[PDB]
Each structure stands twice: as structure tokens, then as C-alpha cells.
């Protein structure tokens, strides 16, 4: 069948799955739990209502004890299934302190040049103003990661609803040329998709967030910065439904 994910694990270690099922729960990316025992249907588990951590700690509590002493004496050729609901889009940033390091991650990265001062013979970040003889003129300063961007917690953020990371692109007057070229520099384009990350079962790809690239290689026609890029944390599909077996 089109989109099956099997797992099937032993007696001995399933402390840690149980763990990792709860994790899920509490951490929002699992919506529900059904439970069966060899395999009559023993019951569901799922917070009362998903946007509060309460609910996704009773949710989670409430997994243990419903399968605690049958796995801790599951017998010979016995087992517990989980037919876990997933959707790794809900998955959060529970704390904001593991919020907090990403954003001064961020900010340890403002003070890296994007792109130079421009020379006559390279291109690079020019004036506005181009000068009396109509002449771009270097710029003051090189282009860097905090001109082009700053970094914090989106606004009310809980651990209800969990805590978003977010860049506000800034405003860059300086243009990109060639000094002394009489034709005006083009404008950087700044991150304007890529604002936030909230999880979500992704990572910032630092290589690839708040990456310059220039298009037209000889003759620049466009300068741009992305903004957050992310790369999938497992080979999961990002929704469905996966069952997990416990056996001995």
C-alpha cells in the first residue's frame, strides 16, 4: 500500500520508543495514537485539545500507564502496536530558550561580508549617489549579514503554541556595480520568503540561508540574499501514518 512506514521493535528497548512516541506527542508533530494489543484495539491517546501543552503532557503521561505494565511482562510471540498519526508540519519549538540559541546562532553570523566594497575593476557594493561626473562611487561600507537582515522570536510566542524564529529583512540603500561605471548599480534583493522557522521537523541549512547569489556571471542583471532554507530532519514523509510494532 502507498505510504506504509513500518518499525518493529524489541522487548528489551522499549522504554525509549515509548519516549520517543511521547516526545512526538509533546512536541505536536503526533496527533494520535492507537494502541492494540496482539492486535485487539486496546484504545487512542491524543491531547483534548492540541494547542495546549497540558493536554500534550496528559496525552503523553496517559501512553504510558495504557501500555507500561504490558510491555514491562509482554509475553513469548506477544506485542503492542502503535498506529501512529503524524504530521511533522505541527511539529514545534516547545522551549524558548532552544529558540533563543538559534536566533544568537543568527547573530553570530552579522558581522560576515556578503559582498565587498566595489573597486573599478570588480563589482561590489557602490553608492547610490553616483558622483559629479555621474560616476558610481564605492560604497562605505561592504554588504553584511546584519545589514540585510535582523533576527528574533516572532511576537507571542508559548510553549502552548510554540516559539517561531524570524528575520526582518533590513533596508540596503547601497547597489551593486562597478566604481566609476556610469550606469547605475542594481539593487540588492533582500529576503523577503524564508522569514521564519517554527520547526516543523526541518533545520536552517546554514550554507544555504542568507546566501548571496548573482545572476548574469560577466554582465550582473540580479543580486539576491535568501532567507532561511531548511533541510528535512529524517527520511519520513512529512505526514501519515506510521505503525510501530513491539515484540519479544
Known sequence: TTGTQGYTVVKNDWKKAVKQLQDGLKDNSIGKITVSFNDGVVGEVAPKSANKKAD????????????????????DGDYVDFSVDYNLENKIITNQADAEAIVTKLNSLNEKTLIDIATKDTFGMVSKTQDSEG???????????????????????????????????????????????????????????????????????????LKVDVTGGSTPSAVAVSGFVTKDDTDLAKSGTINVRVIN
Do not use: H, W
Open 56 to 75: 500534550r503532557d496528559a496525552a503523553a503521561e496517559k501512553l504510558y500507564n495504557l501500555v507500561n505494565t504490558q510491555l514491562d511482562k509482554l509475553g
Open 135 to 209: 560616476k558610481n562611487v564605492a560604497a562605505t561600507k561592504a554588504l553584511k549579514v546584519k545589514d540585510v537582515a535582523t533576527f528574533g522570536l516572532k511576537s507571542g510566542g508559548s510553549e502552548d503554541t510554540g516559539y517561531v524564529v524570524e528575520m526582518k529583512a533590513g533596508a540596503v540603500e547601497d547597489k551593486y556595480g562597478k566604481v566609476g561605471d556610469s550606469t547605475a548599480g542594481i539593487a540588492i534583493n533582500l529576503p523577503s520568503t524564508g522569514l521564519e522557522y517554527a520547526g516543523k521537523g526541518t533545520t536552517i541549512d546554514f550554507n544555504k540561508t
